[PDB]
Amino acid sequence: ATALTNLVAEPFAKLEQDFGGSIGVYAMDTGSGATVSYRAEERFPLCSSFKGFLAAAVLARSQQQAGLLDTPIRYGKNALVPWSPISEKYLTTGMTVAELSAAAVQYSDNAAANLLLKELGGPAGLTAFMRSIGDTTFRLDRWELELNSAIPGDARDTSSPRAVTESLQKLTLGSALAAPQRQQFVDWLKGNTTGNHRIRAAVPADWAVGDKTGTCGVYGTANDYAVVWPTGRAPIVLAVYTRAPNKDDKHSEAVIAAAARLALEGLG
Numbered sequence: 181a182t183a184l185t186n187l188v189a190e191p192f193a194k195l196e197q198d199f200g201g202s203i204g205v206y207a208m209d210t211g212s213g214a215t216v217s218y219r220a221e222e223r224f225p226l227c228s229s230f231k232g233f234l235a236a237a238v239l240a241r242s243q244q245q246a247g248l249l250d251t252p253i254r255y256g257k258n259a260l261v262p263w264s265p266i267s268e269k270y271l272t273t274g275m276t277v278a279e280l281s282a283a284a285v286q287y288s289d290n291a292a293a294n295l296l297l298k299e300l301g302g303p304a305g306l307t308a309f310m311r312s313i314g315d316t317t318f319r320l321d322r323w324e325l326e327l328n329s330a331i332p333g334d335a336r337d338t339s340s341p342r343a344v345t346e347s348l349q350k351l352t353l354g355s356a357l358a359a360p361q362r363q364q365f366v367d368w369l370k371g372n373t374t375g376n377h378r379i380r381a382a383v384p385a386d387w388a389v390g391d392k393t394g395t396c397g398v399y400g401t402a403n404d405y406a407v408v409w410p411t412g413r414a415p416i417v418l419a420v421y422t423r424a425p426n427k428d429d430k431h432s433e434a435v436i437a438a439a440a441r442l443a444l445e446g447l448g
């Protein structure tokens with residue numbers, strides 16, 4: 181007999197009831213192949229969460245272009261947009277691709293993301309990268325900060341929890357990247373600073389987590405995806421995305437953490 185997915189799903193529906201919006205979740209146990217899935221194929225805005233995949237695309241490019249990560253990007257004052265706390269410190273010198281990648285992932289730096297997008301051929305180049313690993317759902321169409329509009333019914337700048345989880349697994353645990361690049365992606369995710377109240381809040385403190393968050397600031401739209409390494413166990417990959425119908429519907433980090441907890445608890 182197969183899983184009773186109605187029973188797996190029920191607590192997400194109650195959670196999203198109180199939240200006033202939609203919650204989408206996919207979780208993969210790479211030990212058993214067990215999954216938990218709730219609106220897992222619906223589209224949600226990526227917001228800043230595309231930046232993890234951007235860092236992976238940079239790493240892929242570095243496989244073809246020796247020393248790419250070492251390359252300085254010396255930018256002007258018009259690179260600087262709000263929520264760029266690292267790239268704003270280094271206007272007088274520039275930053276390396278590696279530093280920009282770390283800042284995009286770990287501080288969600290907007291200008292760093294835009295600079296790296298430019299290096300990879302814009303939103304379309306990142307999307308092409310995702311298509312190269314078999315992700316047909318992911319799309320990045322716009323730049324920072326327009327990509328955060330999160331307009332209900334707009335497919336631009338969205339993915340699904342399932343596609344995000346599958347692509348994250350391929351890139352962090354699978355061999356989609358060479359081993360050095362894969363470990364670098366994992367290390368960047370593990371050093372994220374913005375995720376303490378989201379998936380990480382649902383995970384025992386002695387288990388390593390890498391994650392990337394997103395918060396569009398409108399339409400109750402926010403998210404997190406992660407790899408979790410339980411001690412002496414196969415890792416778990418999961419994604420939690422939210423959205424809501426009114427522009428002034430609040431996002432909730434507590435709802436993300438609660439959903440993560442329901443997904444992690446429900447595996448296998």
Ligand SMILES: *C(=O)N1C[C@H](NOS(=O)(=O)O)CC[C@H]1C(=O)NNC(=O)[C@@H]1CCCNC1
Pocket residue numbers: 227228229263287288289290325328329374393394395396397398
């Ligand atoms: C990403 O979604 N970002 C970047 C930054 N860090 O948040 S997170 O760590 O990724 O969650 C701040 C949130 C956000 C972002 O760029 N905010 N700005 C905006 O989205 C504009 C203002 C608010 C309305 N949308 C446009």
